[PDB]
Design a protein around this ligand. Structure first.
Ligand code: SF4
Ligand code: SF4
Ligand code: FCO
Ligand code: FCO
Ligand code: SF3
Ligand code: SF3
Ligand code: F3S
Ligand code: F3S
Ligand SMILES: [Cl-]
Ligand SMILES: [Cl-]
Ligand SMILES: [Cl-]
Ligand SMILES: [Cl-]
Ligand SMILES: [Mg+2]
Ligand SMILES: [Mg+2]
Ligand code: NI
Ligand code: NI
Lengths: 581, 264, 581, 263
């Protein structure tokens, strides 16, 4: 065994090894390994992406105008965000400026995706780590009604409703076909909700599974379908016609009325179901405000998103702020430049790829994707792995760093950056949330805090949907209908050689696409995605990424049952297809 | 009465077919799971992970051997000894073969499981391969699209439960009910195609009147699916209705048939 | 002034005359006049239909295959029922038998209409006679939640929900723009509900206004649109294809799944919102079990409906029973024959029509529709009716009689016929309902009873939707897909001269269409509609119809505010376009 | 912040246009009434009856003279000195003229108010006459169909409220947005028309594949409306999708253009 120090942690691989493969209730394929000491405390953590497809290779030689459609299929969960980054990148390279309505509609597409993905994760992916579903069968329906009514104005709270939900669950398990609930962790000592809170949460799980399908009707209006809507280089294909012949063939007043109806319903569900449930999880699980901190009190990163001034990606335009913090110094939010070769770099010394020199990092305009499956001296063999060897190559995920630092990205990262830059709405929301819990601001830097920030952001994005809708309607009232710029659509109008960067904040964090065009074709296309950051393997200095750091020093009640590991990994909402592409 | 056992596995994929399923409007996915089938294994939704998830997989395929339906999303890579997609430390293809051996029938959801989809587009770095080139001794129903339509997925499931049989298929294994006709044979812009009324550049006067998208690269004339009739997301829209030509996403090899903006 | 005796009543036109024109919260145009005595009790009542269009005249010379589309436009409220009666009448004339699936689909169309029309009437038309909307502003939201939860398992019952409804109402009225609530009868002493019941009722009014739009999606699947779906002579046009190429062009499994989803939601709303509200109106308004009896303890009529054996209109087939009671003799339910010239006859001695002899009644195969506006001495002029002259002609509605007897039709009439024929489900339902209210059976024969029977029928129809859907799916599983018979579609296959009758039970009561065909064209088309029966004027013997009888003997608290007149008239759900056609 | 006053009156009609309005999916009719307009008079929905309803009518048209919108459903009959349709003891046409005189603009809902509809079909026993032949000094927006599509009615209302203007119209007074193109120019069965693939008798093999309904009498080629694009009842269907040809119900005189089953 070996021991070394990094980032205030002691990384020690002596002692008992535990393996979790597959990780479930995520997107895609992940393996996790840890070592635990005699006191059942994690002393080593290993994050492994167990899939790869090679989109960066497939994109070579394609027409730049088609790229969005290929890279949208990086992920069907965060569907649309890669298309957005792609049209941004190609427009940056060629020198295309889109009309204001196209920019507004793109911002509506992104805010819709934030609302949808944050809601589904809370209930369908993370929820069963916190809610003991079988314990809901022991609840009193009247006491469940009283609890729900004390927390929210949401209409659906009668004792008869909670009795009906409880009886549906009782019938489901009566024949011994427990389905998704079979062989779960029910009764583990870390489940702390009372039976009435478990029944309330289970009812809301079912309400959210139904309601999420409605949110994406906004994507169907502007983008044709969800999953995987359509886009164009130059704007959007959804031409507008309000008051002329043939409005039946375009985005007209009846289509915009459908969008408005969905926005109001989405805000209502998030504010009156998701927000009170997140606060209730906090009230009953306060010790988790001190577990899973990881890199969140050290190094955090946001690129920023939602440009309000069309074609302006600067600080005065982005509604979601960008910036970086390192060394735990939240008094110094630093600006990010995605062209600077000394800022974003990716390492592969601990990943399954070839570089000419694996002891240095490469900026994405110098990126290389040359796959090399080489797990080395594993326990087991190369096609039958019992333990990865984390001293050598152990993942399909590359290792991104910012100025050589390992960073956390996502809702908690963005919330810290906006708070410390002085964004008034963020400061007010965070202060009120932490005051309700009687917890210090430092309590947000934790597994519990990641969940709270995600719920905050769903509320923020639902508000921004209305703001963007009203901006669109103001333009239409003023006779400004344009949705596409086509003066640089044809390849003969492009520079013979050019390069560009497209960036945004996906639901899970900072996203960038780097593209080089030569002679009308894609010459290079490199992606660095939020789960690539968070799920990163180690670098040549031995520095650990966000998942490995958040798992360090965690106590386990029952080593064979990985509930504490699942709670902390699920709090980042892992997307493994995104991470590897 | 007991519900039919279903095992849902995932190879190389983007997860769009799973997301499509949960969008179903009638029946709701909630009601499919609670009342119509027994969804006995699925990495996206299940409580158990790791060794507990492996025990569920083993228990279900043993107890219900010969009696479960296998749903497959994504595909196996043949490159690097299969280690481009790893499940419980071994190649995914070993899990696919074990699950297929006990199944009564297999549903290949999406273009990935049916044909290959984006990871199989040139130069196919991982040697991604569709399910019917690996599993050659079981009935396979192909339900293509990237992803297939939500209410098509749930209608196929309700047909099979209600009628207690597989849907009748074309020569490629696709259900006749939803894949028997072309997009262009049920497209509401066909009047414009017939009259030579075409969009020539984005957001031109033709685009603002809903003219045909053939000259913008629409692949509807060669694509079999239900998008122009059943439509998407509770009947709200489809690609052409919102102004973009069909990409051809339900057809084998659609990524490598030239630019999406070059004519059919 | 004069006085005479008829049907146990003393009809006396001495005393103060009151006029109500227009009657609101009905379909179409009606005027009512009454006389009251020195104790403010009604001693004379006059029902007047104030519109006419002449569909029976317009139908002459049309192709029989087209007739359904014209007569559907008799009414957009009971939309579809006239099309059903028309295809039945033309099929009976020509000798056409339809396939089983067509009959099942037609029964689904009719049951959908019963659910929709009964729900909308309860809330949007009659509800404001019973609920004091402005008094809801004084309610305690917590006490409202407690009341709702004591009556039903319906989920939408939180204190915050009732507060949100109350605040919406407060903001609506605060600027003085009271809309549909302006100059109402709020505060009248006959409003008996406490404030919390008025707020619960108003919340449900709004929920029903939203929900009713969903029910008619069943008509859109099978019939193309609502209002005014499509039909054919020979079956239905909605061809079925489940498992063959081109199912995208027909009724397929996805379309049938939509229908099932609507059926479940419809039953849930009726059983858990409408049924408990109807029973609560009964609990707080028991004196109305003794007001508005009219002809309901004397003479009642049903033709029967919902043939379960395709093409068989006999007693063993009809799921809704037919029969007649006269002279208060409920121990002898009599059979009805719509061809017998001594049974159904219409009189015009008190209506605006010409017959060669106005002292005799004409069966519909001998019917005449020759309009003649002749009001005599009203106070005023021919274009200024100050007081109708009920000694002479006073309405656009003809006077139907059965064997010379004045009859009541509709939900209460049907319930009494089925109960006294010994239908076991009806006997058990009615007995349990009256027991729960601690009222005798005779209490159903009243204004309150009409409302209770309508709610019971909505529940019955919602159950029958599922029964019919399951019968359709059984045929499809057995490979029986046929929806149309076309052997006699072409006019060269028809008899040179033939005649037929189409009959059913519309939501408001017994409906018949009588058609004669000659040389390929309609020679005669006569309709007798449920509101024609109930709103009838007098006959040569001076006998009064159902509305006039139900108003007789009624006490008014405040003569200038006609709340008691409105309660009794609305309890019949008047449809004046239907009555006059 | 006050809402725009609206008076809705009813002549000879079947009430289908009112029923269509309450089917609206987006915005809900509930939200139109509570938040977008002030529906100050409407015999179908209002609490007051008789003398109390007459007082509301008088008060609104006097207080808001020149500033209210008049919605009209149905039409006036000229026969029998107008007494085929009687309102407070007098001809309906007198109430129509009084309401029109104070209105800033008029919405003619449906084929009845726009053209005549079924009561004006041969031999027109009551001499039923469309609104624009009686009221000749006011803006009239025709919204035809029997009835018009629910979400078309609510989209026209929201356009007027949001944009503070009347919709632009064709030479007949119909909104260009929804009535500028023919049913047959946006019909999903047009591929079959172009190929000569027709239903020949009900429930034949062609009908079960969704072939074109031209030989069964479809009047889509001469009818302007939004049914084949916007569709009916929250996008669920339209007449042709469910297997029956268009009747032509948005066009002037459609009842008297021959049998619905003649080409
Ligand atoms: S838009 Fe595409 S599918 Fe539709 S008619 Fe034109 S080419 Fe055919
Ligand atoms: S069904 Fe009617 S509108 Fe459609 S293509 Fe055929 S004739 Fe034209
Ligand atoms: N959100 C999201 Fe997907 C990831 N990680 C992207 O980009
Ligand atoms: N119901 C109804 Fe209409 C009436 N009266 C008919 O028939
Ligand atoms: Fe639906 S997993 Fe998404 S990429 Fe095309 S089908 Fe595959
Ligand atoms: Fe909509 S009232 Fe119905 S008949 Fe044709 S529009 Fe008139
Ligand atoms: S791109 Fe795919 S979703 Fe339908 S319209 Fe074309 S088959
Ligand atoms: S009959 Fe009318 S409803 Fe539309 S499809 Fe034809 S215009
Ligand atoms: Cl799997
Ligand atoms: Cl493919
Ligand atoms: Cl009126
Ligand atoms: Cl007309
Ligand atoms: Mg990359
Ligand atoms: Mg008649
Ligand atoms: Ni993703
Ligand atoms: Ni009616």
């Amino acid at each position: 065994s070996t021991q070394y120090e990094t980032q205030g942690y002691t990384i020690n691989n002596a002692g008992r090894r535990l393996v979790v493969d597959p990780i479930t209730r995520i997107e895609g394929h992940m393996r996790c390994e840890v070592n635990i000491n005699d006191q059942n405390v994690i002393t080593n953590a290993v994050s492994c992406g167990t899939m790869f497809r090679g989109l960066e290779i497939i994109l070579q030689g394609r027409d730049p105008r088609d790229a969005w459609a290929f890279v949208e299929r990086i992920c069907g969960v965060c569907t649309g965000v890669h298309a957005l980054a792609s049209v941004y990148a190609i427009e940056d390279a060629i020198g295309i400026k889109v009309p204001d309505n196209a920019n507004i509609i793109r911002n509506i597409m992104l805010a819709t995706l934030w609302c949808h993905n944050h809601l589904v994760h809370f209930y369908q992916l993370a929820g069963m780590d916190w809610i003991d579903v079988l314990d809901a069968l022991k609840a009193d329906p009247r006491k469940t009604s009283e609890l729900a009514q004390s927390l929210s104005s949401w209409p659906k709270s009668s004792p008869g409703y909670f009795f009906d939900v409880q009886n549906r669950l009782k019938k489901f398990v009566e024949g011994g076909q427990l389905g998704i609930f079979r062989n779960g962790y029910w009764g583990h000592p870390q489940y702390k909700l009372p039976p009435e809170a478990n029944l309330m949460g289970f009812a809301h799980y079912l309400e959210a599974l139904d309601f999420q399908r409605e949110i994406v009707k906004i994507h169907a209006v502007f983008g044709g379908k969800n999953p995987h809507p359509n886009w164009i280089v130059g704007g959007m294909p959804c031409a507008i016609n309000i008051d002329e012949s043939g409005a039946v063939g375009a985005v007209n007043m009846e289509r915009l009325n459908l969008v408005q109806s969905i926005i109001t319903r989405t805000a209502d569900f998030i504010n009156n179901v998701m927000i009170p449930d997140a606060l209730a999880i906090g009230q009953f699980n306060k010790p988790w405000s001190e577990i899973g901190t990881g890199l969140s009190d050290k190094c955090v990163l946001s690129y920023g998103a939602f440009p309000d001034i069309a074609n302006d990606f600067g600080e005065k335009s982005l509604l979601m702020p960008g910036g970086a913090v390192i060394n735990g110094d939240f008094n110094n939010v630093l600006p990010v430049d995605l062209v600077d070769p000394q800022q974003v770099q990716e390492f592969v010394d601990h990943a399954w790829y070839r570089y000419p020199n694996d002891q240095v990092g490469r900026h994405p305009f110098d990126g290389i994707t040359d796959p090399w499956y080489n797990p080395g001296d594993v326990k087991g063999s190369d096609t039958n792995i019992q333990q990865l060897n984390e001293q050598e190559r152990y993942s399909w995920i590359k290792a991104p760093r910012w100025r050589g630092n390992a960073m956390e990205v996502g809702p908690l990262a963005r919330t810290l950056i906006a708070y410390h830059k002085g964004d008034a709405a963020t400061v007010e929301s965070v202060d009120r949330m932490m005051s309700a819990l009687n917890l210090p601001l430092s309590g947000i830097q934790s597994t519990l805090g990641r969940i709270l920030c995600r719920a905050h952001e769903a509320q923020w994005a639902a508000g921004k949907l209305q703001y963007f809708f009203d901006k669109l309607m103001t333009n239409l009232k003023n006779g400004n209908l344009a949705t596409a710029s086509t003066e640089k659509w044809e390849p003969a109008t492009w520079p013979t050689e050019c390069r560009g960067v497209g960036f945004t904040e996906a639901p899970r964090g900072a996203l960038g696409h780097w593209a080089a065009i030569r002679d009308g074709k894609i010459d290079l296309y490199q992606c660095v995605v939020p789960t690539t950051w968070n799920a990163s393997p180690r670098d040549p200095k031995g520095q650990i990424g966000a998942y490995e750091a958040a798992l360090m020093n965690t106590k386990m009640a029952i080593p064979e049952q990985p509930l504490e590991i699942l709670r902390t990994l699920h709090s980042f909402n892992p997307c493994l297809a995104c991470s590897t592409h | 009465k007991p519900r039919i056992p279903v095992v849902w596995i995932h190879g190389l994929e983007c997860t769009c077919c799973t997301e499509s399923f949960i969008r179903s409007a009638h029946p709701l996915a909630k009601d499919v799971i609670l009342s119509l089938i027994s969804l006995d294994y699925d990495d996206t939704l299940m409580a158990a992970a790791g060794t507990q998830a492996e025990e569920v997989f083993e228990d279900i395929i043993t107890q219900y051997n010969g009696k479960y339906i296998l749903a497959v999303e994504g595909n196996p890579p043949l490159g690097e000894q299969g280690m481009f997609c790893i499940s419980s430390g071994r190649p995914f293809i070993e899990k696919l073969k074990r699950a297929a051996a006990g199944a009564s029938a297999i549903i290949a959801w999406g273009t990935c499981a049916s044909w290959g989809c984006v990871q199989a587009a040139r130069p196919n770095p991982t040697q991604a391969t569709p399910i019917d080139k690996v599993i050659t001794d079981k009935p396979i129903i192909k339900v293509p699209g990237c992803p297939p339509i939500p209410d098509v997925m749930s209608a196929i499931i309700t047909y099979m439960v209600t009628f207690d049989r597989l849907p009748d298929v074309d020569r490629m294994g696709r259900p006749l009910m939803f894949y028997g006709q072309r997009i262009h044979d049920k497209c509401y812009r066909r009047a414009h195609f017939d009259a030579g009324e075409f969009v020539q550049s984005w957001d031109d006067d033709a685009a603002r009147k809903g003219y045909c998208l053939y000259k913008m690269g629409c692949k509807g004339p060669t694509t079999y699916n239900a998008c122009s009739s059943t439509r998407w997301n509770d009947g709200v829209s489809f690609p052409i209705q919102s102004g973009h030509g069909c990409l051809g996403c339900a057809e084998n090899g659609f990524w490598d048939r030239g630019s999406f903006y070059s004519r059919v």
